Short mmCIF file of C-alpha atoms in Angstrom, two decimals:
data_model
loop_
_atom_site.label_atom_id
_atom_site.label_comp_id
_atom_site.label_asym_id
_atom_site.label_seq_id
_atom_site.Cartn_x
_atom_site.Cartn_y
_atom_site.Cartn_z
CA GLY A 89 214.63 283.62 99.42
CA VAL A 90 210.90 282.93 100.12
CA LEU A 91 207.96 284.22 97.98
CA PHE A 92 204.71 283.06 99.73
CA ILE A 93 201.57 283.30 97.51
CA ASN A 94 198.27 283.69 99.47
CA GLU A 95 195.21 281.84 97.95
CA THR A 96 193.03 285.05 97.71
CA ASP A 97 195.88 287.06 95.99
CA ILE A 98 195.89 284.93 92.75
CA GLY A 99 192.37 283.44 93.31
CA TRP A 100 190.22 281.11 91.12
CA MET A 101 188.42 283.97 89.17
CA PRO A 102 191.39 284.31 86.72
CA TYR A 103 190.87 280.61 85.67
CA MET A 104 187.04 281.10 85.30
CA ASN A 105 187.60 284.29 83.15
CA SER A 106 190.44 282.67 81.07
CA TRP A 107 188.25 279.53 80.48
CA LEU A 108 185.25 281.75 79.42
CA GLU A 109 187.34 283.88 76.96
CA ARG A 110 189.13 280.62 75.80
CA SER A 111 192.51 282.42 76.31
CA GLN A 112 194.73 279.83 78.16
CA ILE A 113 193.13 276.79 76.37
CA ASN A 114 193.55 278.36 72.85
CA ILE A 115 197.32 279.12 73.43
CA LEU A 116 198.18 275.57 74.75
CA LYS A 117 196.43 273.74 71.80
CA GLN A 118 198.40 275.96 69.29
CA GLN A 119 201.83 275.98 71.09
CA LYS A 120 202.39 272.35 72.34
CA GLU A 121 203.06 268.72 71.20
CA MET A 122 199.59 267.89 72.75
CA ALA A 123 197.71 267.35 69.40
CA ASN A 124 195.18 265.03 71.23
CA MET A 125 193.23 267.90 72.96
CA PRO A 126 189.41 267.39 72.85
CA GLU A 127 188.16 270.53 70.94
CA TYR A 128 186.24 272.86 73.37
CA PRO A 129 182.77 274.33 72.62
CA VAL A 130 182.20 277.95 71.39
CA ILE A 131 181.06 280.09 74.42
CA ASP A 132 178.73 282.46 72.42
CA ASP A 133 178.30 286.13 73.59
CA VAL A 134 175.07 285.17 75.52
CA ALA A 135 176.50 281.83 76.85
CA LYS A 136 179.60 283.63 78.34
CA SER A 137 177.46 286.36 80.06
CA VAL A 138 175.09 283.69 81.56
CA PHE A 139 178.01 281.74 83.23
CA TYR A 140 179.94 284.91 84.39
CA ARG A 141 176.60 286.16 85.89
CA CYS A 142 176.06 282.66 87.49
CA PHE A 143 179.63 281.53 88.62
CA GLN A 144 179.93 284.90 90.47
CA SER A 145 176.35 284.48 91.92
CA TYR A 146 176.78 280.86 93.32
CA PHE A 147 180.35 281.27 94.81
CA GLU A 148 181.21 284.93 95.80
CA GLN A 149 177.60 285.49 97.03
CA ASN A 150 176.68 282.04 98.57
CA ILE A 151 178.16 281.74 102.14
CA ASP A 152 176.16 278.44 102.67
CA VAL A 153 178.11 276.75 99.77
CA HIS A 154 181.53 277.36 101.53
CA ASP A 155 180.14 276.71 105.10
CA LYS A 156 182.03 273.50 106.20
CA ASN A 157 179.01 272.43 108.42
CA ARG A 158 176.46 272.62 105.51
CA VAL A 159 178.74 271.04 102.79
CA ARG A 160 180.56 268.07 104.50
CA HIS A 161 183.21 266.91 101.89
CA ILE A 162 185.13 263.54 102.04
CA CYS A 163 188.55 264.94 100.90
CA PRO A 164 189.53 268.58 101.69
CA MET A 165 188.64 270.02 98.18
CA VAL A 166 190.57 273.24 97.22
CA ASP A 167 188.26 275.96 95.73
CA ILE A 168 189.98 275.87 92.24
CA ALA A 169 189.62 272.00 92.12
CA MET A 170 185.78 272.49 92.33
CA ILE A 171 185.79 275.36 89.71
CA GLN A 172 187.79 273.08 87.29
CA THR A 173 185.18 270.22 87.59
CA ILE A 174 182.26 272.71 86.94
CA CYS A 175 184.17 273.94 83.81
CA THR A 176 184.92 270.40 82.40
CA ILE A 177 181.23 269.29 82.91
CA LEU A 178 179.93 272.61 81.36
CA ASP A 179 182.34 271.86 78.40
CA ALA A 180 180.87 268.31 77.97
CA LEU A 181 177.20 269.53 78.34
CA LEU A 182 177.60 272.37 75.72
CA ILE A 183 179.33 270.09 73.07
CA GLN A 184 176.43 267.52 73.49
CA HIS A 185 173.60 270.19 73.35
CA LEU A 186 175.20 273.07 71.25
CA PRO A 187 173.10 272.64 68.02
CA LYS A 188 169.85 272.30 70.12
CA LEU A 189 170.70 275.50 72.15
CA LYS A 190 171.31 277.62 68.93
CA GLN A 191 167.84 276.51 67.53
CA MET A 192 166.07 277.56 70.82
CA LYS A 193 164.95 281.19 71.65
CA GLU A 194 166.54 283.73 74.11
CA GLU A 195 164.40 282.80 77.22
CA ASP A 196 164.49 278.92 76.97
CA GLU A 197 168.23 279.01 75.85
CA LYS A 198 169.13 281.14 78.98
CA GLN A 199 167.10 278.85 81.39
CA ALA A 200 168.96 275.78 79.99
CA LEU A 201 172.48 277.41 80.24
CA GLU A 202 171.44 278.31 83.87
CA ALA A 203 170.23 274.70 84.56
CA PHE A 204 173.42 273.34 82.82
CA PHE A 205 175.42 275.33 85.46
CA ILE A 206 173.23 274.21 88.46
CA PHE A 207 173.80 270.55 87.32
CA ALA A 208 177.56 271.15 86.62
CA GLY A 209 177.88 272.78 90.10
CA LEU A 210 175.67 270.07 91.74
CA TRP A 211 178.36 267.42 90.91
CA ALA A 212 181.42 269.75 91.26
CA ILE A 213 180.46 270.53 94.94
CA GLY A 214 177.80 267.91 95.95
CA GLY A 215 179.72 264.99 94.32
CA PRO A 216 182.64 265.07 96.83
CA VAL A 217 180.02 265.61 99.66
CA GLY A 218 179.85 262.35 101.69
CA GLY A 219 181.88 260.53 104.40
CA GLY A 220 181.22 260.97 108.16
CA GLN A 221 178.95 258.44 110.01
CA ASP A 222 175.61 259.14 108.17
CA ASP A 223 176.44 259.82 104.46
CA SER A 224 172.60 260.04 104.01
CA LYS A 225 172.38 263.16 106.32
CA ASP A 226 175.50 264.94 104.83
CA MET A 227 173.62 264.44 101.48
CA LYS A 228 170.29 265.80 102.97
CA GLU A 229 172.29 268.77 104.51
CA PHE A 230 173.74 269.64 101.02
CA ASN A 231 170.38 268.76 99.31
CA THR A 232 168.80 271.81 101.10
CA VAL A 233 171.62 274.40 100.34
#
């Protein structure tokens, strides 16, 4: 008896929302033998909003980002695989720069958390960009999107 899940039905948004709220992560650390989990950073009320506002604005909205001809990957990256790499890099950026962010003011804190995404995304998507004949052009095609 076959139950076929479609990719759009479940999606990648549930992971992005569950990672922002720290819902899935929190439960696994508590209720497992995995005691060697690297403690995740605190996504403050502003810091959550700024990623939710951004994640949704550089994936749902951007058609260029998912255009195969613009973004020429090496391996055939699944959408969730890219969202996971954004999330792990955002984790590692926050933990490094958390006490500097909380000392900064509303405007310069927001513009960092925005930049921290753009950089996290840059590697998540642009990192696996490459292959073909001219790697240099598939880089300069992504470099413009």
